[model samples]
Target: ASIFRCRQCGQTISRRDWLLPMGGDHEHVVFNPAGMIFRVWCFSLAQGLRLIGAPSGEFSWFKGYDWTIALCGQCGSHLGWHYEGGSQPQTFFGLIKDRLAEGPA
Candidate 1:
């Protein structure tokens, strides 16, 4: 397993929370699936992530329902957001791929 950290502060955001990675429909506002693709990793309730913004959208994607921006708890970096509900199985911390990196503990 790989570890992810806050880019601004190098905080250990998660080590066990993220368990699956997939090319999914992360919706509710900004990403485009047709022109350019976006990929995200879904994590369980990530302890180091904090949902700080008002939730938006209702059914932006098949699996994406209620959405909100989340930030790195320790450093406040734009990690991505939590997407939930269109399907209960879809509830997860939808972290942006660019915000994560491979690193050692």
Candidate 2:
């Protein structure tokens, strides 16, 4: 028999639980460019100063940035939203490319 697994954690999830509307506990809002579900925000100088080289600060003087997304709790799957912080505090919203797939199904 085939097994259903969480794309993020690789843990098996019951097929019956797939496609169920995520609980309200995991609700959040994000903003993205037109026609896009996710957006990437690079680390800024202020963020670097605060986070760099202080007890597992991985981004110290780092040339690259980090990507983050809010996920569903049931299956630990990307819930299609993200938030970015900066001088203006921008936000982004995203929708999965294949909405029909139901959490990496």
Candidate 3:
């Protein structure tokens, strides 16, 4: 089991909640074109999370089909993103590495 929380306020973000269990882990550690790195980890659902703004873009894997900014419901800290529907099918919240605490596993 794992426990996720807000880095700034230490608010509980996730608690080993996997709503959609894929055949494998969706954990992806990748860098964007601008060299911004993301140690995105796996999380299907959680509490104290607020999806901010509209879906930014389309992706093959996400909550439904697109992704949006995930924030801390308490401190408004940027947690990661929640992917929803788009042209393709996807589902999950990708918690940013820099945002997560020392433990989440």
Write down the lDDT of every candidate, Cα atoms only. 0.64, 0.30, 0.69
Local accuracy of candidate 1 as per-residue lDDT tens digits, 1-82:
4787776777676664455443543322345446544465666556577788676775354345678878888878888777
> Of models 2 and 3, which has the larger lDDT?
3
TM-score: model 1 vs. ground truth: 0.66
Clashes of each: 0, 7, 10
Tens digits of per-residue lDDT for model 2 on 69-100?
43444454553433244123242222232221
Q: In model 3, what is the error at residue 76, expressed in angstroms?
A: 1.9
- Scored by lDDT, model 3 comes in at 0.69
Q: Best TM-score goes to which candidate? A: 3
Instruction: Give residue 37's error in model 3 in angstroms.
Output: 0.4
lDDT of 3 by residue, 14-99 (tens): 76555334436557776655677787776767678889888866443443356788889889988888876633235667788678
Candidate 1 minimal-lDDT segment of 10 residues: 21-30
Give each model a TM-score: 0.66, 0.25, 0.72
On a 0 to 100 scale, what is the lDDT of residue 86 in model 2?
19
User: Which one is best on lDDT?
Assistant: 3
Sequence-dependent TM-score of model 3 = 0.72
